[PDB]
Amino acid sequence: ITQLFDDLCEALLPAANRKRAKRSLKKVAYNALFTNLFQLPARNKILMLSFDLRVGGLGPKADRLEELVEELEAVGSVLDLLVQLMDVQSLISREECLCHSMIQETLQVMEAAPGTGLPTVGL
Amino acid sequence: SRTFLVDPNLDLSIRELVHRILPVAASYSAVTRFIEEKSSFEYGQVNHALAAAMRTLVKEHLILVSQLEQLHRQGLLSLQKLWFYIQPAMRTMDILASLATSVDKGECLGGSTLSLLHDRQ
Amino acid sequence: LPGTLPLASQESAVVEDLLYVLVGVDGRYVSAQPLSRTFLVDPNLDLSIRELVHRILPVAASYSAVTRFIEEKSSFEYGQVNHALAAAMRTLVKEHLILVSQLEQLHRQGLLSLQKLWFYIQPAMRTMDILASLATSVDKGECLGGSTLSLLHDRQ
Amino acid sequence: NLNAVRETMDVLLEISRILNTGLDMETLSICVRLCEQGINPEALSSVIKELRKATEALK
Amino acid sequence: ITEAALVRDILYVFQGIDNIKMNCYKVENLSRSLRDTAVRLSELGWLHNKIRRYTDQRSLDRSFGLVGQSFCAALHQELREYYRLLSVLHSQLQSLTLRRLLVWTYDPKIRLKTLAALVDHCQGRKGGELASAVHAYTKTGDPYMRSLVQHILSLVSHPVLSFLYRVASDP
């Protein structure tokens, strides 16, 4: 258990000082773990999220979320952790925001003061 | 096998690109005629369900043209932007326009229409 | 025909012509000569300009020898080191092309005088002077592999 | 048994994918094995949201 | 001839459709400072032809095999993106200039340099012999190319690892 918190702190560390940040992030893991410790069934919490699925459409996906928790019976504390954390018109509206987020990301640099967006001039 | 005519007096920088979009229409005017004909009973119980399952894609091709006109009203649809949007349709309506021309070439009905779909994203 | 153009206005013709030579494309008046590149400016030009033009060009001639180092030392028959040296030597060329773009967009508003140009490119006159010295010292004595990793350890 | 605990771990990725949790495959096996120890999951929801917070201040 | 007019035709020469006409795209007046930059920019569009002819000539005959498809159908996912860039560049033409294009299209002057030279090294290779001639492009070291070709290999070598998990056969 003293190591399973050390391997967890490695995965969430984004790859590239990577030798002292792990030492400081292990503090944020412990500084936050003991705040809750200082201070209801399991399957019901899924259904309350299954309901909110069906309301906004996408019925079969909600009929799948219940299909797996029924076979996961034949571990309960694991799913209790997960719950804590026009088809064409959307296509033409995606490939149009790209051309709005591609000509903007590069015109904001092409027209500015000489040497702002350039990293070599910042040396 | 449809032929088209564009314009005597048009910009050459357009006609060369127009001829790049039409091959999805000519490949469409040969699928919609395959549905309205191979649906006749005198063609077996296979050349029917082949024409039905070949119709749902035509429905989804009509939605892709609707979402373009609604996106055309805001003017966000330039000609260059069009050539990229229909690319999923230029590949699919190029597959079906090849089966619908290879099932009618050699008259197939029944099993010989189920073999061709096993030899032919 | 710059001889029939005033002094304060013909300067606006050189700066937008000189703003292209730094990219590699030839220019209108300040042309390039066939092949260490040599340039030709003008028979009839103000002497108060030609002496300053020759102070800006050493960033172009030092650039026409880096872009030719990339397009050649990328050939496989040069080892797995003379490659990644040419790749990491390309990102700086990209940032040098952005520095010429931001000058033309700043040239449209006329805020770019010739005297103001000589100060803007100074970060580029120092960097493209370093790479134009490695790309001429890695090819002098044919290096590939470790002997191209030694030279980067002896050489802001 | 390792074949069973692989399947039970493979199904559990999907319900964390459609629930739009940022947990990838590696951080999941870390957190599953750590929850398997017996730590209370109400606290782990805070360390991940803070590790991801201090990670953003770097970029 | 205005500079804007050149920016109008160049955005087409990037595709094959031709002032700029068709091996260099000889342009035919204007000042020398303009013709030179067009020449290099127009030539990038010519490359796009050599990579398009292969994925069109070999998408015709049905005797190219099963590997020669996953290759000819992996040169398209690396072309839709080149069609997304041309989308963005056209929306701004309504401002960008020649010297502004050079930085925009400095990177796709390389991907269209490896692909247009990856389809010539493997011309008559079909079957596995093609999946062995797009692997002889990984011994390059260049971190930008070795991470592009090492992806096309991961698609071309999928049919080969489909027979294996299921070598010349005799009918």
From Swiss-Prot, chain B:
Whom does it interact with, and what assembly results? Component of the gamma-tubulin ring complex (gTuRC) consisting of TUBGCP2, TUBGCP3, TUBGCP4, TUBGCP5 and TUBGCP6 and gamma-tubulin TUBG1 or TUBG2. TUBGCP2, TUBGCP3, TUBGCP4, TUBGCP5 and TUBGCP6 assemble in a 5:5:2:1:1 stoichiometry; each is associated with a gamma-tubulin, thereby arranging 14 gamma-tubulins in a helical manner. Gamma-tubulin at the first position is blocked by TUBGCP3 at the last position, allowing 13 protafilaments to grow into a microtubule.
Tissues of expression = Ubiquitously expressed.
Q: Which organism is it from?
A: Homo sapiens
Subcellular location, record wording: Cytoplasm, Cytoskeleton, Microtubule organizing center, Centrosome
Name the domain of life. Eukaryota
Q: Which disease is it linked to?
A: Cortical dysplasia, complex, with other brain malformations 15: An autosomal recessive disorder characterized by global developmental delay, variably impaired intellectual development, speech delay, facial dysmorphism, microcephaly, and varying degrees of cortical malformations including pachygyria, thin corpus callosum and subcortical band heterotopia. Most patients have generalized seizures.
- The name this protein goes by in its record: Gamma-tubulin complex component 2
The entry's function note states: Component of the gamma-tubulin ring complex (gTuRC) which mediates microtubule nucleation. The gTuRC regulates the minus-end nucleation of alpha-beta tubulin heterodimers that grow into microtubule protafilaments, a critical step in centrosome duplication and spindle formation. Plays a role in neuronal migration.
Q: Which family does it belong to?
A: Belongs to the TUBGCP family.
Outcome, altering R55C: In CDCBM15; uncertain significance
Curated annotation (Swiss-Prot), chain D:
The family assignment reads:
Belongs to the MOZART1 family.
Alphabetical GO CC annotations of the entry are:
centrosome; cytosol; gamma-tubulin ring complex; interphase microtubule organizing center; spindle
Subunit details for this protein?
Associates with the gamma-tubulin ring complex (gTuRC) consisting of TUBGCP2, TUBGCP3, TUBGCP4, TUBGCP5 and TUBGCP6 and gamma-tubulin TUBG1 or TUBG2; within the complex, interacts with TUBGCP3 and TUBGCP6 to form a luminal bridge with actin that stabilizes the initial structure during complex assembly. Interacts with TUBG1.
Q: Which UniProt keywords apply?
A: Acetylation, Cytoplasm, Cytoskeleton
Say which species the protein is native to.
Homo sapiens (Human)
Q: What is its main location?
A: cytoplasm
Official protein name in the record: Mitotic-spindle organizing protein 1
Shown segment, full-protein numbering:
17 to 75 of 82
GO terms for biological process? Answer: gamma-tubulin complex localization; microtubule nucleation by interphase microtubule organizing center; mitotic spindle assembly
User: What gene is this protein a product of?
Assistant: MZT1
Keyword Isomerase included in the entry's annotation: no
What does this protein's UniProt record list under function?
Required for the recruitment and the assembly of the gamma-tubulin ring complex (gTuRC) at the centrosome. The gTuRC regulates the minus-end nucleation of alpha-beta tubulin heterodimers that grow into microtubule protafilaments, a critical step in centrosome duplication and spindle formation.
Q: Where in the cell is it found?
A: Cytoplasm, Cytoskeleton, Microtubule organizing center, Centrosome; Cytoplasm, Cytoskeleton, Spindle
From Swiss-Prot, chain E:
Task: Summarize the protein's role.
Answer: Component of the gamma-tubulin ring complex (gTuRC) which mediates microtubule nucleation. The gTuRC regulates the minus-end nucleation of alpha-beta tubulin heterodimers that grow into microtubule protafilaments, a critical step in centrosome duplication and spindle formation.
Under what name is this protein listed? Gamma-tubulin complex component 3
**Which family does the similarity line name?**
Belongs to the TUBGCP family.
Q: How does it assemble?
A: Component of the gamma-tubulin ring complex (gTuRC) consisting of TUBGCP2, TUBGCP3, TUBGCP4, TUBGCP5 and TUBGCP6 and gamma-tubulin TUBG1 or TUBG2. TUBGCP2, TUBGCP3, TUBGCP4, TUBGCP5 and TUBGCP6 assemble in a 5:5:2:1:1 stoichiometry; each is associated with a gamma-tubulin, thereby arranging 14 gamma-tubulins in a helical manner. Gamma-tubulin at the first position is blocked by TUBGCP3 at the last position, allowing 13 protafilaments to grow into a microtubule.
Where does this polypeptide localize? Cytoplasm, Cytoskeleton, Microtubule organizing center, Centrosome
Range of the intact protein held here: 245 to 452 of 907
Q: Which residues cross the membrane?
A: none
Q: Which organism is it from?
A: Homo sapiens
- The organism sits in which domain of life? Eukaryota
Q: In which tissues is it expressed?
A: Ubiquitously expressed.
